[PDB]
Design a protein around this ligand. Structure first.
Ligand SMILES: CCCCCCCCCCCCCCCCCC(=O)OC[C@H](CO[C@@H]1O[C@H](CO[C@H]2O[C@H](CO)[C@H](O)[C@H](O)[C@H]2O)[C@H](O)[C@H](O)[C@H]1O)OC(=O)CCCCCCCCCCCCCCCCC
Ligand SMILES: CCCCCCCCCCCCCCCCCC(=O)OC[C@H](CO[C@@H]1O[C@H](CO[C@H]2O[C@H](CO)[C@H](O)[C@H](O)[C@H]2O)[C@H](O)[C@H](O)[C@H]1O)OC(=O)CCCCCCCCCCCCCCCCC
Ligand code: CLA
Ligand code: CLA
Ligand code: CLA
Ligand code: CLA
Ligand code: CLA
Ligand SMILES: CC1=C(/C=C/C(C)=C/C=C/C(C)=C/C=C/C=C(C)/C=C/C=C(C)/C=C/C2=C(C)CCCC2(C)C)C(C)(C)CCC1
Ligand SMILES: CC1=C(/C=C/C(C)=C/C=C/C(C)=C/C=C/C=C(C)/C=C/C=C(C)/C=C/C2=C(C)CCCC2(C)C)C(C)(C)CCC1
Ligand SMILES: CC1=C(/C=C/C(C)=C/C=C/C(C)=C/C=C/C=C(C)/C=C/C=C(C)/C=C/C2=C(C)CCCC2(C)C)C(C)(C)CCC1
Ligand SMILES: CC1=C(/C=C/C(C)=C/C=C/C(C)=C/C=C/C=C(C)/C=C/C=C(C)/C=C/C2=C(C)CCCC2(C)C)C(C)(C)CCC1
Ligand SMILES: CCCCCCCS[C@@H]1O[C@H](CO)[C@@H](O)[C@H](O)[C@H]1O
Ligand SMILES: [Ca+2]
Ligand SMILES: [Cl-]
Ligand SMILES: [Cl-]
Ligand SMILES: [Mg+2]
Lengths: 79, 39, 336, 62, 342, 456, 30, 37
């Protein structure tokens, strides 16, 4: 009972709306990365943040219940 | 405004496909530059 | 008359009344498949060990020489032979021929001729029956795959000692070495192959279940529903409109086939194309154009490699590489 | 001469791009075929001439 | 006056572009979160703290190497809930600890339940027998045995498959090197069901398409079919004669044919699930004892079976230090098994 | 008029859906001529544009095979642009070949577009010479004859190049690879056609074994005359009764025959570029697989002998010689896994070979630095590499951007030859079914199997 | 070089669909 | 490299090889414009 998609995406109204919303969503996703926010939301290392300068060992989690505090310690040893 | 077929579907398909090609082409470019390039 | 007696022969060869169709392709197929089968059965049971890698290290393949069904194989001809044709009459003795893997060459060359003629024979009978002609196009997919592992890969690598070994554990050996030497798992044609066989199995179950789901009631509660269809009846045995009404609601309407001809073309095309690509994977890794290599592709700001799952695959590949054919390499690169 | 050569080749590139679009359009267009046929002749002769011009001029910069 | 339950039932079962149903209340959120979790993790989330691995587009991986990886072995079989005692409500730490793996596995499991329920619900509403649901039990047995039972038998979720293309390839090779999984007859039956199913798919589609009746004038023959027609569109009699003369046997019963197309891949996947349940316990088909007795006593006895074990030993020794980092393996160069030169 | 179905370019008029739309051309000789000429333009376009791309990317001091080149190697093998050892002395011939093909593609494209959309759709009303009926067997053999003559001239152009216009690059030239004018082509049919009767198996290699330019040139003298003679033959004759009864006579049947032919040629080309290093010189294409494997054994023989090893008496772990062993017929060959490659022959190695195989005295005393260089180069440019062009074995780390031209050319042409065999089967089966009148399916009122006795 | 390359392939890439569009508006012999 | 006089046309030469691919793509634009009739 709904309009066929081919009628919708060949209409001017569809493209007036989405000529704004699609680029806006694309740009917001771009900025989510380019501002660096994606790194901090998800906790992903930046290229300079996998290792400290002297050690070459992986900050592997070894403690189930203090893993959160263990990650927090591995991160403070970077800067 | 809501009438179907004001913008011919063959043009919609062509432009949309070119958009897909551009974005996928960008991803293949990124395989050779910056992160993941082995360089 | 010669022409009459010959035409009687042609009529019998091409007869649609023989219980098994012979045909002109069958004139080649029947002797070659018989030779390959007889040699394979005898060799699988009784052949002595074979020096597959040409290093005087004979591998036992036959049941009588200490194998079970899972470990037995007919072992490829020796690496010392390479791609040379090694028929019985080029050997000084049957003893020599057996040591050097003669049976393997006899079997695979007769088998390959036989399956190519089997494919042509599928065309031929369809022509005699007034059918459309493309069943052999579907069968060309398994034929291409068999030809890739028994013929093209050894040609590319310069030796039938690297072709598929004719046994269950021998097949696994071929696969594992292949992964170390070509990273076939990271090759997109093998990926298409997997989509072909995973998808073929999926679509078989899907199609089977949808037709079975909408069989028209024609039997009592006691008898098998299979009795509700009689061989050669004119009417369809299931309600394809009911089947489509279910599947179009399961996903969405336009994702479902209502055209049975389109549906069955898709069932043919998906696994066939997938296996074509699988076969082309083996046939192009035969010339060492190998799977994607992302070993050490990710590097941090200083230059340290950050491993990915691709690097873990590489560690397994190395373990296979260093162990395989452990007495056969004297120099640092395995170049074939 | 190096710039003059670069001009003749640029002209050939531009004329080519005009012909690549203009010829199929003209060949499949109903109206103005009489004017189109004359222009396709003119473009084709000019194209051939520019190929020869570039070919000759090549040997004064290479 | 109808009653809110029946009024809700009415709306849930409305014939619309996307059928909802009662089953959709379970299906749609769990499927969406499982898919959304995988896209989120493969796009943005690392595996540095659980595996020592980069695993996202953000870090430089591509579509073949991104993954949502399992938690660290030290997590055991923790449900790893966002609000649980490991992440304690911290979304960022939860991601770094691998919570998206259990997030995807568990929403994925309940989504698959929702989908099978959808198959039942739609079949009941349309009035067809629920064989499609029954066939789907095979994907479910595979997912449950591989992603849940197998790690539950091992030390931790760490050894479950990680959700990624290359990660899955690693899982295959791990199963070869450690379990000798190719030697397992339950895997072999699985292989037979998958390859046999693909064979049936191809041969049935090809046979129908090449025994069509001429029901139109076009050289393209798809248009000469009508969904409401009573007649078979291809000749079962001619197809039966063809295969009888080519191969020796042929289908004669269309109902059996289509049930068999379901039976073969469904049974094969079910058998492979049983073998993986054994592997959860390391109950492998690893060796043939008689082969090992003979080879240990007779250094000239060699089969393809002993050749493949040497490959397995190579896989284990060369992949384990990086693949099992919680073990802190240090294997000095001199102990690594390897043949001559390589 | 204003109707979408008003032309003959739809399924309603033609009986063919859009995805089989070029089948609508079977009986439209004019437009089908356009399609063929336009397609020829595409081939010529690619040859020209790809050469200019290669030349623009070309660093003349790196080997071609380090640079992803496949066309410049073809031009260089004809003796254009190169000197001793395959060194590039002048890139202008590469430029000329690229430009002239690119310019020519415009003429072919012009004629193709003209015939395809503007010119007469069928030719028969316009010209009895250019019009044709697929079922006219004499017209078919006449057009075949014209094209056979064209092909014979083409083969004689290679001969003309080799004998009168600078010669060819000869990897085997005494004193080192160099361009050489061929003055004594092999005309003896026992040699030329002897190649055609050689086994394709190892140590024989059928025509892929051709190993000197005199046989190559003489072979093309033979093919040239054979094609011109056959072309004259087919213009002056029509098919004999035995041929008429053996073949299907339709456009699609003729297409299927050519597809089987091109598939076969594609598989042959695959093996030619994989094994042959005479008409695919390793200086331009890189070493063959066999060559690079032999070069590794040669490299470590040289190294270890320099350290004091007696390579003739060195027993390897298996009991076979670590460096040198016997082939199954006794010839002295390199040991290790490269025992399989003992049929290999190349100019850097043959100075070490005598009547008994590799000569231990020459190995001990006469290996020159240029041979050590060539073996190290070829060992390290073995035709192994990943799809993303990471050179080396599959376990190699990223660093070397390399896939051999031999691998690119072998794989592409196997893929193409394979699908062309599938196309042969498709169109051959369809042409049979269409000639017999059941390509659209079984007649319900006249189903052949229903008139046959049951099998049992 | 990369701005020039992208502009060339943009002009070349539009040319094809431009031919179809021009013939469509002119009601040509598509 | 191209002869130096042609160097300004380097970016054009870089893209020409893909044009044949565009012809296959163009067939589908054209077929879409006539409705795949
Ligand atoms: C088909 C159905 C359709 C689809 C259905 C899909 C629904 C999905 C929802 C189900 C999710 C279940 C999660 C189970 C988690 C689990 O088990 O988590 C595991 C825990 C046990 O904890 C483990 O315990 C281990 C042993 O420890 C014990 O021993 C140690 C050594 O001495 C120490 O002493 C330690 O203190 C002591 O507790 C280790 O500590 C591990 O790290 C730790 O993870 O059990 C437990 O929570 C509960 C255990 C009992 C109930 C098990 C029922 C469910 C699982 C059935 C399959 C069993 C598989 C066997 C292998 C075959
Ligand atoms: C009538 C029409 C039908 C015809 C069917 C007839 C049945 C026979 C079919 C042929 C099967 C051949 C198998 C062996 C082919 C082979 O070992 O081919 C290799 C040979 C080349 O042999 C090599 O040739 C070499 C020549 O190089 C020598 O000479 C060189 C000179 O420069 C160098 O010096 C070099 O170093 C030196 O070694 C050496 O002799 C090697 O020892 C030797 O192995 O290639 C060649 O003969 C060229 C021929 C290759 C054909 C490939 C066929 C593949 C078909 C695949 C189908 C795919 C699936 C389809 C599904 C449907
Ligand atoms: C179909 C809906 C659905 C289902 C079945 C699940 C299931 C799950 N979710 Mg997901 N989730 C959903 C939708 C769903 N989710 C949606 C829409 C969102 C976005 C808001 C999320 C966001 C989300 C996050 C962020 C997380 C989960 C997690 C989980 C897992 C743990 C859940 C848990 O412990 O709940 C416990 C709560 C309940 C079981 C509620 C039950 C209420 C009971 C029945 C009431 C009984 C009342 C009783 C009769 C009254 C008695 C009164 C007395 C006085 C007599 C589980 C697999 C966790 C996970 O995956 O960790 C790995 C996790 O971190 N979900
Ligand atoms: C090698 C590729 C190739 C070639 C040379 C052809 C050629 C042809 N096709 Mg086929 N086709 C192809 C691929 C090809 N096709 C593919 C891949 C498909 C599947 C999509 C089809 C599906 C198809 C169908 C369904 C039909 C054809 C038809 C035709 C013929 C008439 C076309 C027409 O009237 O268009 C009119 C279109 C226009 C007027 C638009 C412009 C077209 C021109 C040629 C573009 C030129 C561009 C070029 C850059 C110009 C350079 C100019 C410069 C040299 C001066 C023509 C001979 C038709 C036929 O058989 O007619 C009897 C027909 O019905 N084709
Ligand atoms: C015989 C065909 C052939 C061969 C052997 C080569 C080989 C090469 N090319 Mg060339 N090229 C070709 C045709 C070919 N090309 C064509 C048609 C074009 C126009 C697009 C070009 C344009 C071109 C450019 C612009 C460049 C090259 C480059 C190269 C080198 C790197 C290749 C690479 O990385 O590929 C990557 C591999 C792929 C992209 C894989 C493609 C897989 C396809 C899709 C499989 C298709 C299967 C089959 C055909 C379809 C079947 C469908 C089925 C349903 C029937 C290598 C020497 C590079 C170079 O180094 O130049 C100096 C380079 O920059 N080529
Ligand atoms: C094999 C390809 C081929 C074939 C069989 C034809 C056939 C035909 N053309 Mg077409 N055409 C072609 C290619 C072809 N053309 C090309 C490449 C172009 C672009 C230049 C054209 C442009 C074209 C136009 C504009 C016209 C035709 C016309 C005709 C018809 C009359 C021709 C005539 O009487 O010439 C008589 C013969 C001569 C005048 C002598 C020709 C000698 C040529 C030019 C040189 C040959 C040298 C050598 C063999 C070429 C090798 C090329 C190779 C390296 C690729 C005839 C059906 C006419 C037509 O259809 O009218 C309704 C017409 O007006 N053609
Ligand atoms: C493009 C090339 C070409 C094509 C398509 C044709 C096509 C034709 N020719 Mg012509 N021919 C040609 C070139 C060509 N010819 C040339 C260059 C010459 C001069 C030598 C001739 C001399 C010639 C003569 C004398 C005759 C023909 C005849 C014919 C017709 C039937 C031929 C036949 O039965 O083949 C199929 C071949 C056979 C049935 C013979 C058995 C084939 C064996 C079993 C195949 C072995 C293939 C082998 C595996 C592959 C290579 C290996 C080998 C080197 C060891 C057919 C129209 C006949 C005709 O009627 O003309 C009027 C005829 O009498 N041709
Ligand atoms: C997790 C989580 C969550 C959720 C989230 C979500 C839900 C998300 C979603 C997301 C999404 C939803 C995303 C998406 C993405 C997408 C993408 C990224 C895409 C891409 C694509 C492409 C790239 C394409 C490709 C292709 C193909 C595939 C085929 C054809 C061709 C082409 C190329 C087109 C929550 C909050 C609850 C909580 C926390 C946790
Ligand atoms: C029919 C048809 C078709 C097809 C078509 C075709 C295929 C065409 C072709 C065409 C062609 C084939 C074209 C070509 C062209 C070319 C040109 C136009 C060129 C030019 C050149 C130039 C301009 C150059 C320049 C230069 C020089 C001289 C030097 C160096 C540098 C440079 C490069 C700059 C289709 C599919 C669409 C479909 C429809 C129908
Ligand atoms: C250049 C050169 C050369 C020479 C070459 C030559 C001289 C070649 C020739 C070639 C030839 C001379 C070839 C031929 C071929 C033939 C064929 C390929 C045939 C086929 C056949 C067929 C296909 C048939 C079929 C059939 C049958 C069997 C039965 C009945 C029916 C029919 C008819 C269908 C050389 C190597 C010295 C060196 C390098 C360069
Ligand atoms: C040499 C030369 C030249 C030439 C050029 C040419 C020859 C061009 C052509 C061009 C072309 C030839 C183009 C084309 C294009 C095409 C396209 C761009 C297409 C696309 C497509 C698509 C995107 C599709 C889509 C779709 C549809 C439509 C439907 C179905 C769906 C799909 C999605 C598939 C010139 C002048 C520059 C000058 C310089 C030199
Ligand atoms: C969400 C769990 C639903 C379980 C079913 C509870 C039905 S409960 C039921 O509902 C009727 C209205 O529909 C009322 O008229 C009735 O009094 C009430 O008992
Ligand atoms: Ca019409
Ligand atoms: Cl091994
Ligand atoms: Cl070695
Ligand atoms: Mg990047």
């Amino acid at each position: 009972g709904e309009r066929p998609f081919s009628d919708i995406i060949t209409s001017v109204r569809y493209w007036v709306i989405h000529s704004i919303t699609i680029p806006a969503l694309f740009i917001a996703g771009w900025l989510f990365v380019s501002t660096g926010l994606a790194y901090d939301v998800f906790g992903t290392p930046r290229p300079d943040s996998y290792y400290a300068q002297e050690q070459r060992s992986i900050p592997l989690v070894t403690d189930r219940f203090e893993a959160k505090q263990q990650v927090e310690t591995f991160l403070e040893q970077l800067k | 405004m809501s009438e179907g077929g004001r913008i011919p579907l063959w043009i919609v398909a062509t432009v949309a496909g070119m958009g897909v090609i551009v974005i996928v082409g960008l991803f293949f470019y990124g395989a050779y530059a910056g992160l993941g390039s082995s360089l | 008359q010669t022409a009459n007696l010959w035409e009687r022969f042609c009529d019998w060869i091409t007869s649609t009344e023989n219980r098994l169709y012979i045909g002109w392709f069958g004139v080649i197929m029947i002797p070659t498949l018989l030779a390959a089968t007889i040699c394979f059965v005898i060799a699988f049971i009784a052949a002595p060990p074979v020096d597959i890698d040409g290093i005087r290290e004979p591998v036992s393949g036959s049941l009588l020489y200490g194998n079970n069904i899972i470990t037995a194989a007919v072992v490829p001809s020796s690496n010392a032979i390479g791609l040379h044709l090694y028929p019985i009459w080029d050997a000084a003795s049957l003893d020599e021929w057996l040591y050097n893997g003669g049976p393997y060459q006899l079997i695979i060359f007769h088998f390959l001729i036989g399956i190519f003629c089997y494919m042509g024979r599928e065309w031929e009978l369809s022509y005699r029956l007034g059918m459309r002609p493309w069943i052999p196009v579907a069968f060309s997919a398994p034929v291409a795959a068999a030809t890739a592992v028994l013929l093209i890969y050894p040609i590319g690598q310069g030796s039938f000692s690297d072709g598929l070994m004719l046994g269950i554990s021998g097949t696994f050996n071929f696969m594992i070495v292949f992964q170390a030497e070509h990273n076939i798992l990271m090759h997109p044609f093998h990926m298409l192959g997997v989509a072909g066989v995973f998808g073929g199995a999926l679509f078989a179950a899907m199609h089977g279940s949808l037709v079975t789901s909408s069989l028209i009631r024609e039997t009592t509660e006691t008898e098998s529903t299979n009795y509700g269809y009689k061989f050669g009846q004119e009417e369809e045995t299931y309600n394809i409109v009911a089947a489509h009404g279910y599947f179009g609601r399961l996903i969405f309407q336009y994702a479902s086939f209502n055209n049975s001809r389109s549906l069955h073309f898709f069932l043919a095309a998906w696994p066939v194309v997938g296996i074509w690509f699988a076969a082309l994977g083996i046939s192009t890794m035969a010339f060492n154009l190998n799977g994607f290599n992302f070993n050490h592709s990710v590097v941090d700001a200083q230059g340290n490699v950050i491993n990915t799952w691709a690097d873990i695959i590489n560690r397994a590949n190395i373990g296979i590489e260093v162990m395989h054919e452990r007495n056969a390499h004297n120099f640092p690169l395995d170049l074939a | 001469m190096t710039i003059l050569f670069q001009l003749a080749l640029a002209a050939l590139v531009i004329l080519s791009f005009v012909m690549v679009i203009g010829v199929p359009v003209a060949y499949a267009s109903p109206q103005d075929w009489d004017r189109s046929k004359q222009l396709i002749f003119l473009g084709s002769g000019l194209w051939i001439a520019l190929v020869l011009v570039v070919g000759v001029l090549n040997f004064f910069v290479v | 006056e109808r009653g809110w339950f029946d009024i809700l039932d009415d709306w849930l079962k409305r014939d619309r572009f996307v059928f909802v149903g009662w089953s959709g209340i379970l299906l749609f959120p769990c499927a969406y979160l499982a898919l959304g979790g995988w896209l989120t993790g493969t796009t943005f989330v690392t595996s540095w703290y659980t595996h020592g691995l980069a695993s996202s587009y953000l870090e430089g991986c591509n579509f073949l190497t991104v993954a949502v990886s399992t938690p660290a072995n030290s997590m055991g079989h923790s449900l790893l809930l966002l609000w649980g005692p490991e992440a304690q409500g911290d979304f960022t730490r939860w991601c770094q600890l691998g919570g998206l793996w259990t997030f995807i596995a568990l929403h994925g499991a309940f989504g698959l339940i929702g989908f099978m329920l959808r198959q039942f619900e739609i079949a009941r509403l349309v009035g067809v027998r629920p064989y499609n649901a029954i066939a789907f039990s095979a994907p479910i047995a595979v997912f449950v045995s591989v992603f849940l039972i197998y790690p539950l038998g091992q030390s931790s979720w760490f050894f479950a498959p990680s959700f990624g293309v290359a990660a899955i390839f690693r899982f295959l090779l791990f199963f070869q090197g450690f379990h000798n999984w190719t030697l397992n007859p339950f895997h072999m039956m699985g292989v037979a069901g998958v390859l046999g199913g693909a064979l049936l798919c191809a041969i049935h589609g090809a046979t129908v398409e090449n025994t069509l009746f001429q029901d139109g004038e076009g050289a393209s023959t798809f248009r000469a079919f009508n969904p409401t027609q009573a007649e078979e569109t291809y000749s079962m009699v001619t197809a039966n004669r063809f295969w009888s003369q080519i191969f020796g046997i042929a289908f004669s019963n269309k109902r059996w044919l289509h049930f068999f197309m379901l039976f073969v891949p469904v049974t094969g996947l079910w058998m492979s699930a049983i073998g993986v349940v054994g592997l959860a316990l390391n109950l492998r088909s690893y060796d043939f004892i008689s082969q090992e007795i003979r080879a240990a006593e007779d250094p000239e006895f060699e089969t393809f079976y002993t050749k493949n074990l040497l490959l397995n030993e190579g896989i284990r020794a060369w992949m384990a230090p990086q693949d099992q980092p919680h073990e802190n393996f240090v294997f000095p160069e001199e102990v690594l098994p390897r043949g001559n030169a390589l | 008029s204003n109707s979408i179905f008003a032309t003959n370019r739809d399924q309603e008029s033609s009986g063919f859906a859009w995805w089989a739309g070029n089948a609508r051309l079977i009986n439209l000789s004019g437009k089908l001529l356009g399609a063929h000429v336009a397609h020829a333009g595409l081939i010529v376009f690619w040859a020209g544009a790809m050469t200019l791309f290669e030349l623009a990317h070309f660093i003349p001091e790196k080997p071609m095979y380090e640079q992803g080149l496949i066309l410049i190697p073809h031009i260089a093998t004809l003796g254009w642009g190169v000197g001793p050892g395959g060194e590039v002395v002048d890139t202008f011939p590469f430029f000329v070949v690229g430009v002239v093909h690119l310019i020519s593609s415009a003429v072919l494209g012009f004629g193709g577009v003209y015939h395809a959309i503007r010119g007469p759709e069928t030719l028969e009303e316009y010209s009895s010479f250019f019009g044709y009926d697929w079922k006219d067997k004499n017209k078919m053999t006449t057009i075949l004859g014209f094209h056979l003559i064209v092909l014979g001239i083409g083969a004689l152009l290679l001969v003309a190049k080799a004998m009168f216009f600078g010669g060819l690059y000869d990897t085997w030239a005494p004193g080192g690879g160099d361009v050489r004018v061929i003055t004594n082509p092999t005309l003896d049919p026992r040699v030329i056609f002897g190649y055609l009767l050689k086994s394709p198996f190892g140590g024989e290699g059928w025509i892929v074994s051709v190993n000197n330019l005199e046989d190559v040139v003489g072979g093309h003298i033979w093919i040239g005359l054979i094609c011109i003679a056959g072309g004259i033959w087919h213009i002056l004759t029509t098919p004999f009764g035995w041929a008429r009864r053996a073949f299907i006579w339709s456009g699609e049947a003729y297409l299927s025959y050519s597809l089987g032919a091109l598939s076969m040629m594609g598989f042959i080309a695959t093996c030619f570029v994989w094994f042959n290093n005479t008409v695919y010189p390793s200086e331009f294409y890189g070493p063959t697989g066999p060559e690079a494997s032999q070069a590794q054994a040669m490299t470590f023989l040289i190294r270890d002998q320099k350290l004091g090893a007696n390579v003739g008496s060195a027993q390897g772990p298996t009991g076979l010689g670590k460096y040198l062993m016997r082939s199954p017929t006794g010839e002295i060959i390199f040991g290790g896994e490269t025992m399989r490659f003992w049929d290999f022959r190349g100019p850097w190695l043959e100075p070490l070979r005598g009547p008994n195989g590799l000569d231990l005295n020459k190995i001990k005393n006469d290996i020159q630095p240029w041979q050590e260089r060539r073996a190290a180069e070829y060992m390290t440019h073995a035709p192994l590499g990943s799809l993303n062009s990471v050179g080396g074995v599959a376990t190699e780390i990223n660093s070397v951007n390399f896939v051999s031209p031999r691998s690119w050319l072998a794989t592409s042409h196997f893929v193409l030859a394979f699908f062309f065999l599938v196309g042969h089967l498709w169109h051959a089966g369809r042409a049979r079914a269409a000639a017999a009148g059941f390509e659209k399916g079984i007649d319900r009122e006249s189903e052949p199997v229903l008139s046959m006795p049951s099998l049992d | 070089e990369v701005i020039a390359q992208l502009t060339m392939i943009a002009m070349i890439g539009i040319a094809g669909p431009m031919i179809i569009f021009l013939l469509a508006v002119r009601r040509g012999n598509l | 490299k191209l002869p130096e006089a042609y160097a300004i046309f380097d970016p054009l030469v870089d893209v020409l090889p893909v044009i044949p691919v565009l012809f296959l793509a163009l067939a589908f634009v054209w077929q879409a414009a006539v409705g795949f009739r």
